[PDB]
DNA sequence: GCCGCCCTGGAGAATCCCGGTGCCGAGGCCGCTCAATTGGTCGTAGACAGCTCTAGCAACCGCTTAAACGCACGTACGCGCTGTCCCCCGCGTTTTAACCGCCAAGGGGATTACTTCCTAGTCTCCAGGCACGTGTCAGATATATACATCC
C-alpha cells in the first residue's frame, strides 16, 4: 500500500471511488518520506475521521 | 396379479416494463472589480482656399530603321513502344521501445506587491551640417609648326 502512499495518484483516484464496504491496506512501510504519506493512508481507509 | 413405459396438466422461476431516486453537464445567479463610459477642456491635424510651376494626355504629324512577321525547309527531339532487371512492396515473425504510471528533490519562471533611481521625454536656445550655387584650377585632348628622311 506504498504504492498508496501519493493521493494524487490514478491509481488513488481509481480505487477510492470503488463501491466498496470494507477496505484493507497491506504494507511493511507505512510511513517513508513524511506526514503526508500516512494522511493519505489514513484517508484511504477512512474519509474524514484524521 | 405385479411391474415397467408413454401421454398430458398446473405450479415455480426468468424477463420486460414502469416508477422513484441519485449523479454528470450546463445554465442562471451572485459577488468582485477593473476597464469601458460619460462629461468637460483644450490643442492641433487636417480640411479648405490660393498661387506657381511642371508633368501627363488626347489626337494628330513626319522620319528612320530595326524589330516583327510570314514562309519554306530540315532535322532534332518529344513521344510511344518494348524489354529487362531490380528494387520496393506485401506479409509473416520477432524484438523493442514508446507510452503510461511512478518516485525524489530542486531550480526556473509566472504572478502579486513594493521600493527606488536612472534615464528618456520635453522644452528652450543656438550653431553647424546639409543642400544648393558658383569661381577657379589642374589633367586630358586636339592641332600648329619645325626637323629627318625616301623617291
Redo the contacts with the bound molecule.
Sequence with gaps: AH?L??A?????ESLNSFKVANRMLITGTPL??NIKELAALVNFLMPGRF
Design positions: 504504492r502512499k501519493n494524487e495518484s490514478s491509481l488513488y517513508q518520506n
